[PDB]
Amino acid sequence: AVLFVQVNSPLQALYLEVVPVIGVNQEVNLTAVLLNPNLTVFYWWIGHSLQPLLSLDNSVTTKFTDAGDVRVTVQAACGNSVLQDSRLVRVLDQFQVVPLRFSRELDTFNPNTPEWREDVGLVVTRLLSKETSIPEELLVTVVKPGLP
Amino acid sequence: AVLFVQVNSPLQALYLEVVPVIGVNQEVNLTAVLLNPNLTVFYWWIGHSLQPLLSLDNSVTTKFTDAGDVRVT
Ligand SMILES: *[C@@H]1O[C@H](CO)[C@@H](O[C@@H]2O[C@H](CO)[C@@H](O[C@@H]3O[C@H](CO)[C@@H](O)[C@H](O)[C@@H]3O)[C@H](O)[C@H]2NC(C)=O)[C@H](O)[C@H]1NC(C)=O
Ligand SMILES: *[C@@H]1O[C@H](CO)[C@@H](O[C@@H]2O[C@H](CO)[C@@H](O[C@@H]3O[C@H](CO)[C@@H](O)[C@H](O)[C@@H]3O)[C@H](O)[C@H]2NC(C)=O)[C@H](O)[C@H]1NC(C)=O
Ligand SMILES: *[C@@H]1O[C@H](CO)[C@@H](O)[C@H](O)[C@H]1NC(C)=O
Ligand SMILES: *[C@@H]1O[C@H](CO)[C@@H](O)[C@H](O)[C@H]1NC(C)=O
Ligand SMILES: *[C@@H]1O[C@H](CO)[C@@H](O)[C@H](O)[C@H]1NC(C)=O
Ligand SMILES: *[C@@H]1O[C@H](CO)[C@@H](O)[C@H](O)[C@H]1NC(C)=O
């Protein structure tokens, strides 16, 4: 007689990591940050279609043929608890991309909390608009999750 | 705000349907008979490896390069 068992009772929090903006036909490297070993259950709701993708890995790679706003949802149920996080992203076509160096010292005070990164990008956008007199909602700053 | 919900509380019984014998390098059409719509969660333990396959469908198709006795769960 055989019996497979798994032991991961408590789940704390999850977060869906995805860039707020990318062009059409571009591969998106969606990440599902969660509390966990290779024993992880991930339901992925990429778009309108109900049928979710199953994954044991944190990340998936997908594309978007259409533009506009896309709802991306991820659900985690490793044990007997259900967590879920959603995020709406913009898929554009008319834009120009500029790389941006930050000062090194910031790295020594840089937690990867997405809200910290959001506020930093917002400050950069405000300063750009104040020093170029160009519209402010047409400038999107994303400061990545990397250690540098 | 968005929230996905699913509603299938009771599960009665299951049964694994598989032929008792087949040769090597032959495709096996394993079936998992269960109480259900396309909302079905299936973990497949094909052999020695712990990592199970995920499936929403009843059936899977696999092969065996080695002979002997295979545990299919
Ligand atoms: C919950 O919130 C916490 C903060 O309260 C987040 O924790 C931080 O997450 C980042 C990203 O995973 C961690 O940085 C990582 O460090 C590893 C090295 O250990 C590096 O290889 C990765 O590339 C990444 O930079 C960070 O250490 C971690 N802790 C803190 C204090 O910032 C967490 O992401 C949030 N997650 C959930 C599921 O709620
Ligand atoms: C539980 O046990 C019951 C019997 O008490 C099994 O029920 C029987 O299962 C077979 C195979 O699925 C059914 O035959 C099927 O009929 C459909 C048409 O409806 C046909 O398209 C299929 O090819 C197949 O031949 C049968 O009707 C069903 N009921 C009876 C009274 O025999 C069941 O398979 C067992 N399953 C579990 C999960 O415990
Ligand atoms: C996604 O990120 C991982 C981690 O760096 C990398 O190995 C992989 O090539 C990336 N894929 C794409 C399509 O960006
Ligand atoms: C988890 O399993 C996958 C199988 O698809 C494998 O690619 C990955 O390396 C495994 N990770 C760990 C940490 O064992
Ligand atoms: C498995 O059975 C289904 C149902 O008849 C059939 O469509 C499929 O081709 C079969 N595959 C193999 C490899 O026997
Ligand atoms: C269930 O979803 C799968 C998607 O892989 C599809 O192939 C199948 O036709 C669907 N079945 C039903 C009954 O909707």
* A8 in reach of chain B (CB within 8 A): no
* PDB experimental method: X-ray
Gap between the terminal Cα atoms of chain A: 52
CA distance A3 to chain B (A): 9
Contact B51 A43 (CB under 8 A): no
The size of the A-B interface in CB pairs under 8 A is: 26
**CB A46, CB A13: distance < 8 Å:** no
